[PDB]
């Protein structure tokens, strides 16, 4: 899905403009490329070029890496993280939980996403009170079921006013919020 | 707290594309230039001995819009000209900072070199890594205090604190006026800062000796017509139209007594007057500062003269007059 | 920064603790007092470890027989390394407060 | 409109010396001339408003915040208020031999803020062009230089014209003051005929001052002197802290105590 | 390499003032010109630095029996899906790689400021204080006492152009240009002469240039009065004497310091 979106953007002029605004980095299955790309990514954050690291939620990079101040400032989530519904391994794991412990397939399936999504979006708040905004580019997160299964600390900050901001509307609040955090305590 | 009275400050303005965005009520570039013009004149009006020089960076290249000079009008003219600038390209801190470094490298040690980068587009495409340039700046003791716009850029954060400067982000247009005006005042001298005596020259206004006898005709020194009378130099002996201006030959600063006296009040900051809203046995209806009835429950008083001042009086006194009227007696 | 926790008095290296930490420590002590397995969540990636580590150390001193030792597991060796730094800092703070070495051992496999 | 402020320098030590000398000119006439100038000023237009300030060795007190003789009611209040107030200040005054020099810097200080107070309250629709018609009458004090210079700069930024009218003496500081802000400087030598000057030189306002012939400005000697001697010096060696004009190169300037490093 | 010749050619006609003054020092054969200087597309360019492969191809594929337009065409030209991601990482990495080249103050005397550089019995106060107190028991004498016509008339006459307190030529235009050019010439050569004059520079190598520069003052000043003579013998009006003071004052500093140097020795 990442490649398809990347290719689609590449055909249009959207991808090129993003390259102009900021450097762009992408993740691959091979670990060797991932380490080099991330190693370069850190340098870009230090410098003023910036970087946009595309990655996969299940990627070992997402779990292994930790984002701190001036690293992964704004975590962007493109789509609710769901595993493919064809891998037969999950079925025995999934359907069994329905038979034993009485968990609905959708409940665990959605729980498999919010936990996975929360894992890959809770890094920006590592420590030392370093500001950061977590934007989830999917209307599914706006559903009450997703919001409830979201961790309490993130959810309580979230409000209905900004729950379903438009792309233009979401950008404007992001700009304003960063201003407030820029000034000292 | 030691203060560096003389300072060569560069207001690096970025001609980046992001300046096109009209986040402020007028165009972002125009608002800075319009307000920066206020800063330029005010800066000279609060530090005559100092001089300023503007660098404009765009399309990954830095061009000196106006070299160091002591004439506020000359710099002001450049600002208005830049209002029509195309404003297309991408800035380069290394290019901009390097240009400032080259001209400021040869500046005298006693004067406090400073740079105020008005950063607009968060990106910084530079030919060389900027962290290396930081090492040079600290050795060159050039203070760089960025004022970011709509972004808390990381690289400039270390730039300000490592180099000694301060980092800020514009909360709004009203807050923007506050920030630049703050930088107008000379910054305190830190441990790295060193002070040294500087040669100074005081000219006297001169005119025709007696009925244009043994006159001293001359045109100017930086379409000037003949001048019957004007300022001169102890050493250049070259006519100067306006002061204060650096010698074009001696290299020794020319400046009259009043200009120096304009900077004395910095050495003598006015202690803030306690605000006591209640009357506090102040039976004088008329404000001593302005001889006007106190229409608000606010009063200010010194620790020496113990006088009474209304809101306008105290606000004015600390802001511009920089001295207590009654407490002078 | 000695904290007079409801269960006992607990030391702490950093100067201040947010209200969540108070809620964290008291809830953790309740599970320890009940001597029953449980689960809890803390937002901060860092800060919980020192609060989690500090409370266990204080509980060990009060009831050494209750708890033989602490087995604190982390996902990855690069990550677990950051934990021992937190523990190492805490011991020096506690050692300075006590002023002498105590029979306490901490190691990572 | 225009808000005039007349800073009359009524120094009893100097003015009283005239009374002892029994000279033709007296403080009473000086107040009357200034009174007339204020009355004539407000005469110019209804929107115009004025004020007055007196100077004494101790302090400065404002002299200004029916038709019995068939007079204009408003100016009548001005005539009565100033006459009553000026006599009270002169009649009652403590004696301090230590301090006798006339105070002017503080007197101006009250004016500058006063104009600022008026400038705030007045409606933004009408623009106010303030002015200060300083009328010195005695020699200035050396110790007042620093304070007096600051107020003059404050006037420049605030756009107020200091129209000095020194008489019987040329105070180099005051003539230096007026030049910075562009105010006129007239040294009347005929004290009895002082009033003819004001209605012709000072009375016309900045709006019409340019389109009018007035006495040329006097050359200003912007002298500089070392703190050693107070003598004219053309080359000064200031430091980066004191910003003080000194005589000759020294290992360390006394007013700084800085650890200057030779080179 | 003849770098100096290239620089002169670049500024030979680009800047008139710089070459106009430099030639003038040689128009009259004052001194050698050696001391003069001694003392004082984007897309291809981005690709040039962006892709080392293109740089290697360009060197190997330098135009030979081909056209630049064709070279432009060659630029743009699951297996392909992964190529774009790899190219962006490499292209982005290359772009990043290209950009990474291998005191509280205290004082003891504050009263000094209060009386800055500006320069400068007991019963008399009592006599004046009481005498003035009795002055204004009478007030509002304005009717006649404030002014008199006889005194008033004199004041107006004084305000006349011939009166007291009221004291009261652009004929040459083409001469203006000539004078401006001469003044600039003085500044260029004075600048270097005064560049190290104020500093003592008690060093053998530092002092030599001053001696050479000091001698150059005689040479440059040797020709200056000759041009003055031409201008002087026109109308003998509007004397130009300001230029002389600079030369004599420069001479006075030269001779006075020369005597001081001898005195120090
Ligand atoms: Zn000079
Ligand atoms: Zn007041
Ligand atoms: Zn006071
Ligand atoms: Zn001296
Ligand atoms: Zn000093």
PDB file of N, CA, C and O and ligand atoms in Angstrom, chain B residues 287-292 308-314, chain D residues 117, ligand 2:
ATOM      1  N   UNK B 287      -2.319  63.862  39.771  1.00  0.00           N
ATOM      2  CA  UNK B 287      -1.097  63.090  39.594  1.00  0.00           C
ATOM      3  C   UNK B 287       0.100  64.026  39.500  1.00  0.00           C
ATOM      4  O   UNK B 287       0.087  64.986  38.727  1.00  0.00           O
ATOM      5  N   UNK B 288       1.145  63.743  40.281  1.00  0.00           N
ATOM      6  CA  UNK B 288       2.327  64.598  40.245  1.00  0.00           C
ATOM      7  C   UNK B 288       2.967  64.591  38.866  1.00  0.00           C
ATOM      8  O   UNK B 288       3.448  65.626  38.391  1.00  0.00           O
ATOM      9  N   UNK B 289       2.998  63.430  38.214  1.00  0.00           N
ATOM     10  CA  UNK B 289       3.622  63.354  36.904  1.00  0.00           C
ATOM     11  C   UNK B 289       2.966  64.275  35.892  1.00  0.00           C
ATOM     12  O   UNK B 289       3.645  65.016  35.179  1.00  0.00           O
ATOM     13  N   UNK B 290       1.636  64.255  35.829  1.00  0.00           N
ATOM     14  CA  UNK B 290       0.897  64.995  34.816  1.00  0.00           C
ATOM     15  C   UNK B 290      -0.080  66.010  35.393  1.00  0.00           C
ATOM     16  O   UNK B 290      -0.829  66.624  34.627  1.00  0.00           O
ATOM     17  N   UNK B 291      -0.097  66.204  36.712  1.00  0.00           N
ATOM     18  CA  UNK B 291      -1.032  67.134  37.345  1.00  0.00           C
ATOM     19  C   UNK B 291      -2.457  66.884  36.863  1.00  0.00           C
ATOM     20  O   UNK B 291      -3.193  67.807  36.514  1.00  0.00           O
ATOM     21  N   UNK B 292      -2.839  65.618  36.834  1.00  0.00           N
ATOM     22  CA  UNK B 292      -4.184  65.234  36.435  1.00  0.00           C
ATOM     23  C   UNK B 292      -4.784  64.266  37.429  1.00  0.00           C
ATOM     24  O   UNK B 292      -4.081  63.446  38.016  1.00  0.00           O
ATOM     25  N   UNK B 308       4.169  60.337  43.212  1.00  0.00           N
ATOM     26  CA  UNK B 308       2.975  59.638  42.752  1.00  0.00           C
ATOM     27  C   UNK B 308       2.840  59.845  41.251  1.00  0.00           C
ATOM     28  O   UNK B 308       2.901  60.981  40.767  1.00  0.00           O
ATOM     29  N   UNK B 309       2.650  58.750  40.518  1.00  0.00           N
ATOM     30  CA  UNK B 309       2.510  58.790  39.070  1.00  0.00           C
ATOM     31  C   UNK B 309       1.350  57.907  38.641  1.00  0.00           C
ATOM     32  O   UNK B 309       1.157  56.813  39.180  1.00  0.00           O
ATOM     33  N   UNK B 310       0.580  58.385  37.666  1.00  0.00           N
ATOM     34  CA  UNK B 310      -0.545  57.621  37.149  1.00  0.00           C
ATOM     35  C   UNK B 310      -0.056  56.590  36.132  1.00  0.00           C
ATOM     36  O   UNK B 310       1.142  56.435  35.882  1.00  0.00           O
ATOM     37  N   UNK B 311      -1.009  55.871  35.536  1.00  0.00           N
ATOM     38  CA  UNK B 311      -0.655  54.790  34.619  1.00  0.00           C
ATOM     39  C   UNK B 311       0.103  55.333  33.415  1.00  0.00           C
ATOM     40  O   UNK B 311       1.148  54.797  33.029  1.00  0.00           O
ATOM     41  N   UNK B 312      -0.401  56.407  32.806  1.00  0.00           N
ATOM     42  CA  UNK B 312       0.267  56.964  31.635  1.00  0.00           C
ATOM     43  C   UNK B 312       1.651  57.485  31.992  1.00  0.00           C
ATOM     44  O   UNK B 312       2.609  57.298  31.233  1.00  0.00           O
ATOM     45  N   UNK B 313       1.778  58.139  33.147  1.00  0.00           N
ATOM     46  CA  UNK B 313       3.062  58.714  33.530  1.00  0.00           C
ATOM     47  C   UNK B 313       4.122  57.632  33.688  1.00  0.00           C
ATOM     48  O   UNK B 313       5.202  57.712  33.090  1.00  0.00           O
ATOM     49  N   UNK B 314       3.830  56.601  34.483  1.00  0.00           N
ATOM     50  CA  UNK B 314       4.821  55.555  34.708  1.00  0.00           C
ATOM     51  C   UNK B 314       5.124  54.798  33.422  1.00  0.00           C
ATOM     52  O   UNK B 314       6.288  54.498  33.129  1.00  0.00           O
TER      53      UNK B 314
ATOM     54  N   UNK D 117       0.068  63.027  28.171  1.00  0.00           N
ATOM     55  CA  UNK D 117      -1.232  62.796  28.787  1.00  0.00           C
ATOM     56  C   UNK D 117      -2.347  63.421  27.959  1.00  0.00           C
ATOM     57  O   UNK D 117      -3.376  62.783  27.705  1.00  0.00           O
TER      58      UNK D 117
HETATM   59 ZN1  LIG F   2       0.078  61.197  35.576  1.00  0.00          ZN
END
